[model samples]
Target: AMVVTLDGEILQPGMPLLHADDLAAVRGDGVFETLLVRDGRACLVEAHLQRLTQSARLMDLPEPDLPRWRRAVEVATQRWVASTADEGALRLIYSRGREGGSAPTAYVMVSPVPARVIGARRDGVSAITLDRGLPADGGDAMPWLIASAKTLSYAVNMAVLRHAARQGAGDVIFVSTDGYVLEGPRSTVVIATDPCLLTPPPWYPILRGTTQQALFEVARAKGYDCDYRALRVADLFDSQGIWLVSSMTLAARVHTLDGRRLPRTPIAEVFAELVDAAIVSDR
Candidate 1:
């Protein structure tokens, strides 16, 4: 029923939720997660919880109490299913409340999964690669950057997506100053080379891709090679196919990158196979 919970208190969306002086609202000092609830069940729920705890730890915020947090998510998801569609999204947020506060602010919200996401996965998307202004080894030994954490400081990424929209593209891939392909603003970059899947190495501060990991695990179990290969900008054109993946988008084929058409592969067929396998195995 399109509901929200603040510190375990259920409320309507129209109600006041945030304080003007909240750290997340003012300084963007918080960590959050977005996960998909498919087939009336939460997908990769434990993984998402682990990542939430990890993200909170990285942000120096309160570590999520798994039992309580999980219960809250279950309640939120149930409320959503009772009021709206079967499949939807679950968002978990925790922020440093006030300068002198003892604990962080936390909440759970559930909403419908947008129809356009299915459209993107069914049809396809064109993306552009832009420089992320950081080197391959950037943010190393620098936790202050909060590079690994999915913090609330997303203005830059959102701005890039907006800029790409103006340029008539649906997504953007980030490249480093050293010409190394990094990742997408909101998704992880995956290259499929027939029986092999490739992604950037973890030498830098790349976020752990939960969906990518799950897909690769199923791919391996189903007879495929998975590796964290170093992908360069030039490799995009030579790769069999490219994909932008996340918990929400699941996996979407990249039709074009930086105005150049990528060579075709049986990616849709392979993607379907992988997803089908993942769904069955994920259970």
Candidate 2:
């Protein structure tokens, strides 16, 4: 089930919405944020919006109207919560409007969380490494890479997941051309290295993950040391445990990578629970 709103007006299913020439549709030119809706409220709403604003700016687009976007979220989530369980995915999209036009196109949609996402968090996942073809520091000086932005242009990410499926894997951990661990296509990589929890630094051409940030905070509160640095593939294999985290899945441990069994550690569950608690507190 799904509920959609365009510019604050709720729309019924099967209605004509986006224009044919909308940049988001034709060129995948836009910015979006997907957050969890649980316990009758959206999680980390302000943080997601802040990231969306940064994405828009990085893409050289106009600033997002925060009040307007917030209202759209309220309008869509209201219908979503009323019609189904108050838990799912809510996406806010801002596109560079119709072709040859200057005005932007925006909308909000709420939908049930996919089974795979839930399964990942519950059952963990098997992953494979794929080369991203960019040096670990290759994108640092490349503004077009939008290293920290979460734009709607995720064709490559999606394609790599399909490639993972073909390789009989449930997920992908993208590695830089220089063999440094980058991140998952739709998630951030976090590893437990005994005394410290480590993740890739923001300079590695990856989206700065909101969930990872929250996880680090939770870990810090629990007296776990956390750090950010470049990690190599060997480092992942050497870690005590590995998890791929995102706003939707929360945290999914990678029990297998590249056909090798990774150590199953209980810390994955502990971290997931801590982050889950933090997110739900937003309501």
Candidate 3:
């Protein structure tokens, strides 16, 4: 049984629907969050809401009604927890006011967690570097604005992921035209040396991943130096350890990049542990 919300009202899966004039449809203007829900409660809900609000503000969308949104997520998760007796995935989507209308539309939905992608975590995955330069500040695509914000218009990003999957890989690591490593399509890139943990600066057009931010604390507590700055693609190839940090995927190693086999590193396991700890603490 699927549950859909239209402007905050619950509706049946087959209920009649109308395409509202929200910016999400008119101009693909909005922000969203995909959260991990276990036992009727969303893990790290506060962090997710914080990021959502930031994204909304960045895209010039009205400040989100986070309290109401949180209740909607709770209601959705409760239904899943009662029926499935297992964890679920919840998605909260918020769109800007209609093209020439007022008041934004807030939508929510939930679904059973898929096992295939989760299984990929236990068995590490391969990735490739795509050399697609990001757009300049507030350009036509507004890549800069939406890069920082988790906006709904993710067609190109999804296309990149599909392209990577076709190439026998699981994820795509974006590299700038100047050879600097930016980030993954939906994750953050982190490289570890003997003593320091390095990630690209948020100002460098990389999405500020919640997982990545939490791991920075873990690195410090473990006596590893952590810094945020620009990272070159060559550095990633030569680095001792490389990882992609995200919500669902958590942390995974890059076994191969552009068809070249990367040596296995002991750091991947350590990073994984740190991520897991963050997950537990956030809950």
Candidate 4:
């Protein structure tokens, strides 16, 4: 994979492309989006771009030329498709400029999507709960900026994932100190109960996942009740179905949590189909 620098210079793997004052290097000051590319085009490219622009604005950074950026992504994705002809993940990193007033850098890289993600839909995933105290006000951890925006400062999020993996779990479900279920490290948490499909409100410091939003549409179309409400960790453990939703992975069910086996529910399959249909029909 090659890294496209702010000045349009390409850096191959292991090539140096940083400076003492690079915001991404120095403070993790930036935002990014990852899109899945299949065949010869990118999936949800515009949606991701819009979210990226929102993230930048939330962080008080200058708005990017989204249309131009989309074109660049399309070109790069086309090149990758021509070479690989296989499904892959495309990552776009938009970083703040260096201290010397350089333009913000935009880097794109591509890699094969892991096979485990496909298998997960069939076999589901095992997850555990981690009590990371929730943000105050029931949401909006950063009141000045949008908490739902995708920011580049993700060290703590990555650490949570690591901690979950070390505990023999595939993912972590973040819970607030006050017992409200927040979200997963890289995904949105959803639970099912009698006639209700519940998930945390977007205002609750949760990233507004494209997959989750699309699935909600499916739920509505099918006459299934859905709500964006506060959920407790105890609620997750007692729910009829629990799953995590994201772009790359779609929906993955929790087979176990905290070493306790969870009962499989038919809702998981329904949610999976809804997501699959949405992705296939996404424009």
Candidate 5:
């Protein structure tokens, strides 16, 4: 079962939620977030909230009422608390509303995490690199396009993932046109080498990663060296291990890239331990 809250109104599944002219539906103009809900609690929610606020700023949307949002999410979780599933997702969205309207459309949808994500966590993915056709730091240099915002306009990212799927790969790593390694369409890149863990710098066009930030903080406190550096495709191959990190999926080891099988590392499991502890090890 799924529950959706639209502007504080309780909406059951299949209820009329949006009109044909909603900006998000008509023009894909919006900002959104996907977060993990474990054991009826929103896991690491403040980090997700901070990123959402930042994305809204990039898109020129209002600073959302987080307490109101949290209220809806709390009720939605209560509705879903009896689920037999292992975990769930909290999808928060805010759009520009109807074409001639000033009010924004904001809502939270609560549902079970998909089986595909579950499978990906249990079985790591094979990925390929595809150029995003933008330079590193592309978004900051062009803030008008809101390049760093997690907006509804993801046709390119969606198509690229499908293109990789047709090539027999499960995911993709977005490379800059100039050949700098960026990030995954739905995941952040993490490279692990023993006591050191590295990710691309934050100033790139990529949305700053909440899961990656939490993992880095935990790893540092646990005595791992963390660095934000630029990477090339060759660097991923040279590293001892590579991972894709996100909120719900947590951490997935990269099994292969461009058909070349990577060396599987126990370092991947170490990350899962750190992430799960930070996310779901308590009430």
Candidate 6:
């Protein structure tokens, strides 16, 4: 594990850094990006940085120091390469700073991917849909919700993931109040059928998934049509393949949903290969 401040200071694991009054600690007021670091290279760095900027802007925080943050990620990745795991999850966090401070808080942390994530990526997962209790198209009118921003207020997401665990599911897919399939707590939902691949539009209350976007491009190149559109629970049951994509997980097949076994498709291995190539090649 490695932690690097925007100032290029690398701290040892478990070292104290944030102030007592930091808004991130007090109110979970922050925006963050988690990108994969493969063999010392941060994958989809530009896309991740752009998404981070959008999240910060939505939260009304100062514009991130993009160049500085990019360098900070490089610093953290290089340090991880020097003394830690071969592959890691690189996180860049920008907070609203201390309770009364004028400047924002920013840093980067890199840590090894969890073993469970690796196993899930290999063997897939079982998920259940949970209603998010929000209108699918209400984000534009409700800016305060910051629904699309990847903010630090993830206690609810974690709680629901725990709820899924209690229900014997490995993950969760959040459905909108109007019955549209939105996204997973920590991933993006993708359904592949025949020569077509589809996912929910990011214009809604969902974070734009870097991995899914990259995978879509590769899928297009392979002669598969891809589109961003609304989906429903029935879509998963009917699709030939269902996957949850994230930066670290890349692509994990959803073998079962809502306690029903889904049909298996060979596209899973192909999609995983495409994602792995994109991330490894830093595309």
Query: Could you say which candidate leads in lDDT?
Result: 6
In angstroms, the error of model 1 at 57 is: 1.3
Off by over 4 Å in 4: 2-14, 136-142
RMSD, each candidate, Å?
Answer: 1.8, 1.4, 2.9, 2.3, 1.6, 1.3
Question: Tens digit of lDDT per residue, candidate 2, span 66-147?
Answer: 8888888887777778877747799988898898999898888888889998789888899999999888887676867777
User: Relative to the unseen true structure, what is the Cα RMSD of model 3?
Assistant: 2.9
TM-score of each: 0.94, 0.96, 0.88, 0.90, 0.95, 0.96
Against the reference, the lDDT scores of all candidates come to 0.81, 0.86, 0.77, 0.78, 0.82, 0.87
Worst 10 residues of 4 by lDDT: 2-11
- Cα lDDT tens digits, model 5, 24-126, are 9999999988888787687876777788898889888889888878887777666667665567788887898888988899888877788778777888899
Ranking by TM-score: 6, 2, 5, 1, 4, 3
Steric clashes per prediction: 1, 0, 0, 0, 0, 0
Model 3 regions more than 4 Å off: 1-8, 16-20, 97-99, 135-146
Ordered by lDDT, highest first, the candidates read 6, 2, 5, 1, 4, 3
Query: In angstroms, how far off is 166's CA in candidate 6?
Result: 0.7
Candidate 6's TM-score reads 0.96
Segments of candidate 1 deviating more than 4 angstroms: 1-3, 276-280
Candidate 5 yields a Cα-based lDDT of: 0.82
In candidate 6, residue 245 scores what lDDT? 92
